[PDB]
Structure formats: C-alpha cells, structure tokens
From a paper:
In ITC experiments, ATPγS exhibited similar binding affinity to Spa47 as did ATP, but AMPPNP bound poorly to Spa47, with ~15-fold lower affinity. We performed crystal soaking experiments to determine the crystal structures of Spa47Δ1-83-ATPγS and Spa47Δ1-83-AMPPNP. In stark contrast, we observed much less electron density for AMPPNP at the P-loop. Indeed, only the triphosphate moiety could be located in the electron density map, and electron density for the sugar and adenosine base was poor. In the final refined model, the occupancy for AMPPNP is < 1.0. However, neither the electron density nor the occupancy of AMPPNP could be improved, even in the presence of 85 mM AMPPNP. However, when ATPγS accommodates the active site of Spa47Δ1-83, all solvent molecules are expelled except the catalytic magnesium and one ordered water molecule. However, this was not the case in the Spa47Δ1-83-AMPPNP structure; the ATP-binding site remained occupied by a number of solvent molecules, resembling the situation in the unliganded structure. Of these bonds, the hydrogen bond between NH of G162 and the oxygen between the β- and γ-phosphates of ATPγS (length = 2.5 Å, angle = 130.4°) plays a vital role in ATP recognition; when this oxygen was replaced by an NH group in AMPPNP, the hydrogen bond donated by G162 was not observed, and the loss of this hydrogen bond could explain the dramatic reduction in binding affinity for AMPPNP. By contrast, a similar movement of the side chains of F167 and F339 was not observed in the Spa47Δ1-83-AMPPNP structure, indicating that the base of AMPPNP did not fully occupy the ATP-binding pocket.
Author numbering: -3 to -1, 84 to 311, 313 to 380, 393 to 430
The structure:
C-alpha cells in the first residue's frame, strides 16, 4: 500500500473518515501542522524499544490497582454486547493522563460513532484527541484503512516525543474486513471462515505500538467483540499477541457492577514490572480477599462478608469519576486492614 494520510497537531479535535477528510470536529486547535505519513509502517526494531517500566495510569481503581498497565503496553478488551465496553473506553480516555489520544472506530453504526463524538465534545480531553472512523456503510478496504490511519497518526505523535494512547474498537470488525479482502483476492478459508493471512498480518499491526528508547510511546487498547459462547480464534490470537486482556463480564454488567471488569479473568502481563513491591503485596492481599468473597457467593466468614459492600464499592466506578493512584491505593489499603 502506497497510501499516505495526514498527521500532525492539525488533526487534534478532528473526526476523520477512511478517506482522510474531516467530517466533524469536537474541538478546534490553534496549531495547523499537517504533514503526510504512510499508513503502512513497520513496527519499531527491537533495538529501538524501551522496556515497559512506567505505569500507564488509567484513573480506574480496579485496573490501576489489580491490572496496572504500562506505558507502551498493548491491552485487549474482551466483551460481549452491552457490557459497557464503550464506556470503559471513554473512561480510559478521560481519567488517564496521556498527551494525545487517537481513537479508531471500525465498522460501527453511525449512531455509535456519534456517541463517541458527542462524548468528546463534552470532555476536557477534546483538545488532545483525534477520532478516525469507518461507519458500517463503508467497504472492507475502508474499515481496514481506518485502523491503519489511526495507528499512523499515533505513530507520528510518538515520534514527536508524546505519550500516546491508541484505541481500536474493534479488532473483530477489522479482522472481518481483512477477511473479506482476502477472500476477494481468491484466498482459501483456513479453519474458521478466515484465510490464514489475516491472523498472520495481525502481529505487524498490533506491534506498531510501544515505548521508544528515543522518547515517546504508544499504549494501545484493542477491543474484541465476543459472542455468547455461540461459535473464537480471533480472541485467542489477540490474547496471545497482546500482553494482557481486560474481560468484561455480562454477569457483572446485568448486576449493575460498572465497569464490569472481571479481575479473575483479566491480567496485565507487565503488572510486576510497573508497580513497586508494596503495591504488589497490597494487590495480592486484595485478590485473596476477592477469592474469599467468591467462596461466600456459593449460595471470620462473617468478617469478609462485611467487607463485601466496601469491596463492591471499591470495584464500582461511575464513568464520570477518575481516581488518582494515591486515592485508589488508599482505598485498597482500607479494605485489606
Ligand atoms: N461506568 C458506568 N457508569 C455508568 N453507567 C454505565 C457505566 N458503564 C456502563 N453504563 C451503562 O451501560 C450503558 C453503556 O453501554 P456501552 O458502553 O455502549 O457498552 P457497549 O458494550 O459498547 N454496547 P455495544 O457496543 O453496542 O456492545 C449505558 O446505557 C449506561 O447506562
Ligand atoms: Mg499525528
Ligand atoms: Mg485526514
Ligand atoms: Mg531502555
Ligand atoms: Mg488481577
Ligand atoms: Mg456501544
Ligand atoms: Mg468510544
Ligand atoms: Mg447501533
Ligand atoms: Mg461509504
Ligand atoms: Mg466490501
Ligand atoms: Mg490453512
Ligand atoms: Mg514497548
Ligand atoms: Mg507482554
Ligand atoms: Mg467504568
Ligand atoms: Mg460510583
Ligand atoms: Mg473522584
Ligand atoms: Mg496519580
């Protein structure tokens, strides 16, 4: 692919379609830097990467505490329908502290793209975001390119030295679109209706993020849309390529526990290397308390029972609230004492 796309501070505040034109704005920005960069870009050389050591603070208590992210990390978000994945995304943008946010919405309905644009228009981060989208009326090629364009905009901000958060919602529809392109090129379905080339191409896309020795980072969140145990190689491919997954539980969602993150089914694979030992001990104590609260949910013992409302109160977090690290750990501290 020879296609270049616009990059620069000029795009901050902009809503961009798969063809590169601006079709709405959620903020206007003084700078009008516009340059061009390729949408196909190799990931960094291993020699160019910095170790993930500094946390990417989300402002989300259950994550910052039990599933701490690292700057330069790739994190999966796995969710079935209506478990609040879009709100989680909005939260991760709002309550974090990145310099730049780049969002890529792939094959969503026009109503879904407008929720996000509506969200940005009302957010403090508006001056810091770029939104790229391909609504469901767009072709497979356009859905794919929307993901590349988004990544390429993040890449440019990273080379500038910035601390960038990339969001791709969803890889599921990205892979479906990539599949159709492959089928139309005459490729054969391998195992599930996907030709083998779409899974083979995934590492190249999903390894473009990361921390650079030279300065700057992309921390990336990729959503994977789950069916209710219906017929999911894509999820297991993504689980294996990223370094962590946040699982959204429908049980917790219907129950009202938002964000419906199931810590037992989630992991950050950089956890240990981005939090100190006091955090680790405190977090592991908290997980012990959790698994002890689940032993009760099978229907001293009464003491952990009284710890439930304070725990649930720790987990639950209205999408409009953000918590500092100190606030979150302060709260963890109280539930384990
Ligand atoms: N943290 C939260 N605080 C408050 N309300 C929440 C929260 N999370 C979810 N909700 C509620 O749940 C809905 C959020 O749905 P949404 O975030 O779009 O999930 P979704 O998985 O993206 N839906 P879909 O994309 O079509 O599968 C809203 O109608 C809210 O009322
Ligand atoms: Mg850029
Ligand atoms: Mg453009
Ligand atoms: Mg280094
Ligand atoms: Mg955990
Ligand atoms: Mg939604
Ligand atoms: Mg969103
Ligand atoms: Mg819809
Ligand atoms: Mg169209
Ligand atoms: Mg098509
Ligand atoms: Mg095969
Ligand atoms: Mg890295
Ligand atoms: Mg890893
Ligand atoms: Mg939430
Ligand atoms: Mg609340
Ligand atoms: Mg608060
Ligand atoms: Mg903080």
């Amino acid at each position: 692919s020879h296609m270049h796309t616009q990059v620069g501070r000029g795009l901050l505040g902009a809503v961009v379609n798969p063809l590169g034109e601006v079709t709405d704005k959620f903020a206007v920005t003084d700078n009008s830097e516009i340059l061009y960069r390729p949408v196909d870009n190799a990931p960094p050389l291993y020699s160019e990467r910095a170790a993930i050591e500094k946390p990417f603070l989300t402002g989300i208590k259950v994550i910052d505490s039990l599933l701490t992210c690292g700057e330069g990390q790739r994190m999966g978000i796995f969710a079935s329908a209506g478990c609040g994945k879009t709100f989680l995304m909005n939260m991760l943008i709002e309550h974090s502290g990145a310099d730049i946010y780049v969002i890529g919405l792939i094959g969503e309905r026009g109503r879904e793209v407008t929720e996000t644009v509506d969200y940005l228009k009302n957010s403090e981060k508006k001056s810091r975001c770029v939104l790229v989208y391909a609504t469901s009326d767009y072709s497979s090629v356009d859905r794919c390119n929307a993901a590349y364009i988004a990544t390429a905009i993040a890449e440019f901000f990273r080379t500038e030295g910035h601390k960038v958060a990339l969001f791709i919602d969803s890889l599921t529809r990205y892979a479906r679109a990539l599949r159709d392109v492959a089928l139309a090129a005459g490729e054969s379905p391998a195992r599930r209706g996907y030709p083998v080339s779409v899974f083979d191409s995934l590492p190249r896309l999903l390894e473009r993020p990361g921390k650079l020795k030279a300065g700057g980072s992309i921390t990336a969140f990729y959503t994977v849309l789950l069916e209710d145990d219906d017929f999911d190689p894509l999820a297991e491919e993504v689980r294996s390529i990223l370094d962590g997954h946040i699982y959204l539980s429908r049980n917790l969602a219907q129950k009202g526990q938002f964000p419906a993150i199931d810590s037992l089914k989630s992991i950050s694979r950089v956890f240990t290397q981005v939090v100190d030992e006091k955090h680790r001990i405190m977090a592991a104590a908290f997980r012990e308390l959790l698994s002890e609260i689940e032993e009760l949910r099978t229907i001293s013992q009464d003491k952990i029972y009284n710890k439930i409302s304070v725990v649930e109160s720790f987990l639950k977090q209205d999408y409009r609230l953000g918590f500092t690290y100190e606030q979150t750990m302060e709260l963890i501290g109280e539930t384990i004492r």
